[PDB]
Amino acid sequence: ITSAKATAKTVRTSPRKARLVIDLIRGKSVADAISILKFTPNKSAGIIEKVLMSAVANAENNFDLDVESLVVSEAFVNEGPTMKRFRPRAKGSASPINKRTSHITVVVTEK
Amino acid sequence: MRTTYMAKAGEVERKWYVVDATDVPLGRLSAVVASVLRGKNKPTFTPHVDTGDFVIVINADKVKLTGKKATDKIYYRHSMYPGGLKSVTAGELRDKNSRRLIETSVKGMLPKNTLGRKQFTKLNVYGGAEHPHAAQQPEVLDITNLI
Amino acid sequence: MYAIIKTGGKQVKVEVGQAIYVEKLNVEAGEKVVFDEVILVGGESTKVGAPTVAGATVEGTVEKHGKQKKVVTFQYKPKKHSHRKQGHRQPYTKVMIEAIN
Amino acid sequence: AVPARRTSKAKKAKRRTHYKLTIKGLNACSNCGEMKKSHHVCPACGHYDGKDV
Amino acid sequence: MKLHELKPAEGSRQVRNRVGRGTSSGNGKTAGRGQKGQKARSGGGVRLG
Amino acid sequence: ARVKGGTVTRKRRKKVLKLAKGYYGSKHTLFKSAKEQVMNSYYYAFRDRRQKKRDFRKLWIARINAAARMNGLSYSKLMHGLKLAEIDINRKMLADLAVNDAAAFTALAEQAKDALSK
RNA sequence: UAGUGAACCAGUACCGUGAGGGAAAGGUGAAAAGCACCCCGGAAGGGGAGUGAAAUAGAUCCUGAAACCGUGUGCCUACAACAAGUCAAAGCUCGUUAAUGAGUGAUGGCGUGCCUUUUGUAGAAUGAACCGGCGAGUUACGAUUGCAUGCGAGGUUAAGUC
RNA sequence: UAUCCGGGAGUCAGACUGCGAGUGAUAAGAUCCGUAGUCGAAAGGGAAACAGCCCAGACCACCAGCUAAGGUCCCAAAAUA
RNA sequence: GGUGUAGUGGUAGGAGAGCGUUCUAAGGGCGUUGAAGGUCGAUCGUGAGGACGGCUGGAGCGCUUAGAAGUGAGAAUGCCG
C-alpha cells in the first residue's frame, strides 16, 4: 500500500545497456531520477523514464501516496523473449542474430 | 573428544627477546631465532596462528661465517630481465648490510606463506650493540646452549 | 579436580558433572558404570599412575547410546572405471561423570 | 585467435567493473529551478545565464 | 494359492543379466566383451570350427 | 512397455549438486563439474580422515617438546623416561597438561627425570 | 523429441532446374465469465477496479525443472601464485527432521580434473561450451549347460477340431 | 590345496628394477631371452617432485599406542645425542 | 542367534545379492480436508537409494506379492531444443 510499481515487458532494447541506466537511478529520489534520465542520452533512458513516470502515476492515482517523498526503492531489468534472426555472411553461410528484449521494472515507495 | 587446545589470535602474549650474534655461526643463530619467531618454544604453539615472540638481533656485524663462506658463499638474485643475475658474497653483505644477511638467512627458514611472512616481520636485526626498542622491555635470550 | 581415564583404547579427561562420549559400552542407558583404569588424577594435588593410580576409580551414568554423523567412504581409481561407496555411523555412549575417587 | 577457455561469470563481471555509465554536470537552473547541465541552455525554460534564448 | 500371495518354487526363475548398465554391475562399458578385437564387434566372431 | 526417462535422472543429479553446495561457481552449479568435484572431495576426505590422526599427533608432540624444554628436557628424553617410569599417559593428554596444567606436567617431567637417572 | 513424416490446414512450409528431400508446431478456465470503467503512455505495456475457487490460470495462458540473466544481502575478500577441494580452524551471522546444529570463513596442512586409449596420461595424446530430453546385447527359431517342476523305463504331443 | 568333469570368460602391444646371457660399441629409458620382484590391476610412508626403486598390501570409525624403509638445526615430527 | 579363528586393494573378467523406473494381475489402501509433479530442509539405510515436514501444484497415486520390459547416461567431433 506504501509502494507502487510499473513494468514494461518485451521492450526492444539490450538488457545490459538498459541495466546501465537502471544502475544510475536505483535508490534515488524520484525528482533526481527523473532529471538523470532526462539528461542521459542513451536509448534506454527514455524507456525507463516512461516506466518511472508510470510508476509514479500509479503511486499517486491508485494509492494516493506522497509524490514528493517518493523514492526509487527497487528497479531492475529482466531478460525478455529473444527474437531470432539471421544475417548472411561470406561464403554462403548465415550467422544467428539475437534481437533482445527487456522487462523493465521500477518500484517506488513512500520513503 | 576434540579437546585439543587451539590458540586464538590476540590471546597469547608475545614477548621480546634480545639475541647477541657475536661469533655465533650465521645458520645456527638463524635456526634458533626462527624457532622463537614461529613460537615452537612455547606449549601454546598452534600451527595456523602466530604465537611466537619478537626478536631483536644485535651485533649482526659480528656474526660468524665458518670456513671460506665469507668470500665463497654467494647470494644470487635475478632481476627477471635477461642476463639480470646479480651476486654478492656473504662477507660483503656482513660488512656493509648485515641486517640483510641475517634477514635472508631467517627468511629461508620460516614458512613460505602468509603466516611465515608475518612472523618474519617480528624480526629486528641491528649491526652493533644498541637498538631503539627499549620501550618494549626486551629480555636477553642466551643461546650458547641452544646452538 | 579432574581425572584421566583409559576408555575405548583411548584416554579421556573427566570432571564431575561433565558428559563424555566414548566407544559403545555394553551397558543399558541410565545405568552406572565404573572406570577402574585411572592413569592420572589432578586438581589441587596430582596423582600419577605407573601405569595406573592404585585404588582410584571414576563413576558415571550412561546417559545415552547413539550414532555419530554418517561418514561416507567412496573409493575410486581414475580411468579404471571402478568405484565403491560405503557408509558408516560409529556407535557412541555418552556418560555423565558422577564421582571421581 | 579464439578463446582457449570460456570466460567465467566472475571474470566477466570483473571485466565489466569499469563498463558503467555516468552522469555529470547537473545542477539547478537559476531561472526555473529545474535540473540542467552546467554551461548548457536549460531545456525547460530555455534560459542561460539568466536570459531567455 | 491366492493371486496376491504367489510364490515361485525356489530356484525356478532367475533375473536376466543386463550388460552395459554401469560399471558397478561388472558388465558396464565393454559389456563383458573385453577390449577391441574382432570378438568385441557387433556381429563379431568367427564361424564355428 | 515404454519406460520414458521420468524423474530418477533429476533426483540423482540433484543429490550430487546438494553435496556440491558451497563450491566455486560452476563447481556447485553444473552437474558434470559438480560430480567431478564431489568425487575428488570423497577422495580427499578419505585420505584426510587418515592424515588427520597424523597431524594431531604431530601437534601434540611439538607442544610436548616445548613444555619438556621449559622443564629442562627434550621430548625424546621425556618419553624415554616416562616409558621407564611406566607412565602410559598418551600424547594427547600430555599436550593438554602442558598447555593447561603446567604443574601436573612438571610432576610428570620430574618422574621421567628420576627414572632416567636410575 | 514418443506414436504415422504428419494428433495442429503435412507430404504443407522450406530446399532443389528436376527426379527428389522434407520440418516445426497439442493443453486458459467448469463455464469466456477473454479484464466494463479509471490512471501513466503515441502505442506497446503496466497499476488499480472487476470476472473467476484460483489471474504468479490474462490468451507467449495447466504444471513451469536446469542451463542462462538479474535484484536484495548474512559472512568473506584489494601482499596474493588458487584441478578450487579436503582436513584443522578464530571470528561473525543464524536457530534445525534438536542433531556431540546450520551459513560463512581469516589462517594452516595435504592435494596436477572426468573419460577414452595405453607399458605408461595432470597430461603438451582423445572427447565433452553448458543445461534438458532422446540415445547402444533385443526378439524369433534352433543348439547346449545349470537351476526348477511334472512324470519316470519312460517322457511328450505337432498340425488340426471345439 | 591338487586332479578330473562341465558352464562362463578375458588375455596373444607389456614396462621397468635386480641377477645370468646374446645382439649393440661389455652405448641407449636400446633390443632379445632366462630368472625374481613391482607396476600393469596397489592406495599409504621414504626417495624434493618422480607407474616399475626402498618399506608396505586401504572392509570401516577414533583428536589412542608401537614400529618398517627413511630420519631427528629451521622449512618439517623427532638427538644442536 | 552366540562365541571363536581367519579373511574383506583391484583392471579384463566370472559368480552372488540387491536398489530404482514404467506397465499387468490380485489384495489392501491414499486423494479438492489437496494425488502426481516442482522446490526447500540440519532426515534414514552399508550402496543403489527410502521417508517425513514447509511451500508450489490442481487430479490422479502409493504399498504387499507375483509377472513383463522400449528399465537406469556423462562422455559416441552423438541427434534435437
Ligand SMILES: [K+]
Ligand atoms: K564375457
Ligand SMILES: [K+]
Ligand atoms: K494456474
Ligand SMILES: [K+]
Ligand atoms: K548472490
Ligand SMILES: [K+]
Ligand atoms: K585450503
Ligand SMILES: [K+]
Ligand atoms: K593431436
Ligand SMILES: [K+]
Ligand atoms: K533347460
Ligand SMILES: [K+]
Ligand atoms: K574351466
Ligand SMILES: [K+]
Ligand atoms: K629382466
Ligand SMILES: [K+]
Ligand atoms: K515435499
Ligand SMILES: [K+]
Ligand atoms: K554429448
Ligand SMILES: [Mg+2]
Ligand atoms: Mg552467395
Ligand SMILES: [Mg+2]
Ligand atoms: Mg525373463
Ligand SMILES: [Mg+2]
Ligand atoms: Mg570387472
Ligand SMILES: [Mg+2]
Ligand atoms: Mg563410462
Ligand SMILES: [Mg+2]
Ligand atoms: Mg572401447
Ligand SMILES: [Mg+2]
Ligand atoms: Mg589390443
